[PDB]
């Protein structure tokens, strides 16, 4: 019943939901705050020995196969974001409309919103690309319309195997959610009643979290494809490094004193069991450099240890 | 559970501009003239772009005069508020550690109270923090160092769950150089218990301490964060309006009008000869590009020539506007500046004294309450008594206390109407006694024949 | 006209807000809240509400 | 679902009547009554009986 506002609260802050961090997604997306030096932060752990248990013949041992132990290396790539220089204009929208001078405050609000949005979108894109490079993707585009309410999720469970419990969330675009709503609202197989047509979970105890990130949508018209990728406990890690800087600088030489606002910050990405191939990639990757596969090595031996799986639906 | 540190709440973001302008006003003329572009608009922008215009702007600003009454306004208000010294109620022998050196730097609690009151009177915000070391220290957090707080309702009670503030320090190597450590302090209230996290941030690094919950002398941990935020209006986490905003705006308007007035004074202040009705023939014949204006020498002029010694006249309407600004600031601030010309009727001013001391009374109570709560938390840390009080000098417009008042207070002490300590505090506040009460007593039982 | 809105900002930025109402309510509250209100009744029982 | 027989939501008749339903959000439609109400009563003479108007 809230319509009356304060001043300039109408200033649009964001349209995509970015409340997808830590406890919001059952611990699927970790947004910590810790510093780390250099463009890379790698951690090394012991690899799983392949032929630990072997058949043996006590009657004739004959020769013994040699063995050895290795050390896998994980990774955490650092990305640097920023803000284009923002002009601070004089209040010239004053025909009959009003025009304030709270440019710093307005930019602060919009910048907080878009910083949350940018880290979330980059994390989602990196996760999708990494899982696709790991082979944990199920493409459902030719079967029927393209998305089923519940029978599609069983495919992702079959991908992830005996550890299916370890998935407890489904980050998705809004269109797949509405398709689930429509198919549920038309129960060709009668397992819904009018009071239960608005289920958000996937009939397996996994809630579905909805966001319209451009990283989870691609194409247009008949090539439109939606990615609804499920996570594990802390699969995608985002570590902002506490290096926010901002300035306001005036300019001389033009007709008006040109004021500017420029900001800069950084954060780190880490996807469980996956390492960012810095040789094929770069020191500071672009958002489209993260989304490119073959830059994401599969460190963990088994797909189960790697956290996440991607479901592709039209 | 640890996220988005070094993030400033957006209300503080809206308030930083006002805080910065107020700090500039407190600094004096130099700060204002350093950023004259923000305050004084250029009279002509088309010239302003050109190099011949920027030098004109510099010369325009240098001639300008900064009144800087706001700084005096704050200094005067801190004047009557801290006349004499604040009173402390409770044991003294077990509380000397907080009184003599409140934060371990040898700085008395009175000086920190003075700083906090000045901070909360100028831009209307400040914070106190007490933490165990064994001895607790009553820290002081500036208005700009507090940068994040939360207020949720647990069991239907207004509670400050999260609070994060920044502290500056310089690491000490074997060298003589100065480095900076932006150590943050994270304060959280989970399920009615107090927890705090510190961020080491080693010089050239960023490291963080583990979670830990400070506990009282007996135990039981806590139920509220020992961080109190005092403001001009009250003691709430919400932002309060700085009391100096209108006075700073008036001072800035007066400053720009003073710039205009001083430019006019430099240009048209000097009288000008203005030889009119003159001909170049007359000039090159008699004047020769030089006029002698002394008393001993005269100058001739042709037929129908009128010399007019013309100059800018006094009581310029710009000066009238500046006088309006001075009067308006006088109307707002109690004693930012004084006036020798005016005469005040005594007794009528006593009616309006309470209204003129409105901000002084509030600030005093807000600070007194904050320091009393901090001292109570320190006592909880040390397991001392809880019925203690640190109440500032709420009485203002102080002066030497009259002989009639002296007889009155002595007679009131003879009766059972004023306690001995109350009368001692009175006679001290009136500038008539300076020894502590115990010394006066222990000399009073002495049987001096005189 | 855009020069008109520029003229309007030049006209407004030069103005001065007296701010007499803020000082008024300040003095009014000061007069009301001089010393402190008096509480009648038991205090050792109501201390949790006063504090 | 709010029911309303408002002629702004029917717009047609016979086989081309097109009912329109609105899905609104909080404060979607704002109406302010400008309290500028003025009502006059004017009367006339010169007839067999007095005539009024509102």
Short mmCIF file of N, CA, C and O in Angstrom, two decimals, chain B residues 52 93 128 163 167 181 192 197 200 229 236 250 256 274 307 342 372 388 395-396 401 425 435:
data_model
loop_
_atom_site.label_atom_id
_atom_site.label_comp_id
_atom_site.label_asym_id
_atom_site.label_seq_id
_atom_site.Cartn_x
_atom_site.Cartn_y
_atom_site.Cartn_z
N UNK B 52 42.83 34.35 -19.98
CA UNK B 52 42.70 35.67 -19.35
C UNK B 52 41.55 35.72 -18.36
O UNK B 52 41.43 36.70 -17.62
N UNK B 93 38.44 6.54 43.35
CA UNK B 93 39.71 5.84 43.53
C UNK B 93 39.83 4.62 42.63
O UNK B 93 40.95 4.25 42.24
N UNK B 128 31.20 6.48 20.34
CA UNK B 128 32.04 5.98 21.42
C UNK B 128 32.11 4.47 21.35
O UNK B 128 31.14 3.81 20.97
N UNK B 163 27.51 -3.33 13.11
CA UNK B 163 28.12 -2.01 13.12
C UNK B 163 29.59 -2.16 12.77
O UNK B 163 30.31 -2.93 13.42
N UNK B 167 39.39 2.54 11.60
CA UNK B 167 40.39 3.15 12.47
C UNK B 167 41.70 3.26 11.71
O UNK B 167 42.07 2.35 10.96
N UNK B 181 47.58 2.26 8.33
CA UNK B 181 46.87 0.99 8.47
C UNK B 181 45.39 1.28 8.62
O UNK B 181 44.97 1.84 9.64
N UNK B 192 21.26 -12.36 20.43
CA UNK B 192 21.42 -11.66 21.69
C UNK B 192 22.77 -11.84 22.35
O UNK B 192 22.85 -11.89 23.59
N UNK B 197 34.91 -8.82 15.17
CA UNK B 197 35.99 -9.30 14.32
C UNK B 197 36.89 -8.11 14.00
O UNK B 197 36.39 -7.02 13.69
N UNK B 200 43.38 -7.35 10.67
CA UNK B 200 44.75 -6.93 10.95
C UNK B 200 45.27 -5.96 9.89
O UNK B 200 45.74 -4.87 10.23
N UNK B 229 26.23 5.94 19.46
CA UNK B 229 26.35 7.01 18.49
C UNK B 229 25.52 8.19 18.99
O UNK B 229 24.30 8.08 19.12
N UNK B 236 20.81 8.01 18.36
CA UNK B 236 20.29 6.94 17.52
C UNK B 236 21.23 6.73 16.35
O UNK B 236 21.93 7.67 15.95
N UNK B 250 24.85 30.73 5.18
CA UNK B 250 24.86 32.18 5.31
C UNK B 250 26.28 32.73 5.19
O UNK B 250 26.50 33.77 4.56
N UNK B 256 30.72 35.35 -0.78
CA UNK B 256 30.65 35.73 -2.19
C UNK B 256 30.26 37.20 -2.35
O UNK B 256 30.78 37.91 -3.22
N UNK B 274 38.68 62.58 -14.14
CA UNK B 274 37.63 62.76 -15.14
C UNK B 274 37.63 64.18 -15.70
O UNK B 274 36.69 64.96 -15.52
N UNK B 307 35.80 69.57 -14.52
CA UNK B 307 36.43 68.40 -13.88
C UNK B 307 35.53 67.85 -12.79
O UNK B 307 35.00 68.60 -11.96
N UNK B 342 24.98 47.72 20.13
CA UNK B 342 23.66 47.39 20.64
C UNK B 342 23.63 47.39 22.16
O UNK B 342 24.64 47.17 22.83
N UNK B 372 27.96 8.40 29.96
CA UNK B 372 27.48 7.60 31.07
C UNK B 372 27.31 6.15 30.66
O UNK B 372 27.70 5.23 31.40
N UNK B 388 26.68 4.81 38.33
CA UNK B 388 27.63 5.90 38.14
C UNK B 388 27.07 6.83 37.07
O UNK B 388 26.25 6.44 36.24
N UNK B 395 24.71 23.91 32.81
CA UNK B 395 24.49 25.36 33.09
C UNK B 395 25.41 26.18 32.18
O UNK B 395 26.62 25.87 32.13
N UNK B 396 24.85 27.18 31.49
CA UNK B 396 25.64 28.01 30.55
C UNK B 396 25.60 29.47 31.01
O UNK B 396 25.04 29.73 32.09
N UNK B 401 30.35 34.14 40.99
CA UNK B 401 29.10 34.01 41.72
C UNK B 401 29.03 35.04 42.84
O UNK B 401 30.00 35.25 43.58
N UNK B 425 30.26 22.04 44.70
CA UNK B 425 30.24 22.17 43.24
C UNK B 425 29.75 23.55 42.83
O UNK B 425 30.24 24.12 41.84
N UNK B 435 40.07 23.95 45.74
CA UNK B 435 40.48 22.68 46.32
C UNK B 435 39.36 21.65 46.21
O UNK B 435 38.18 22.00 46.15
#
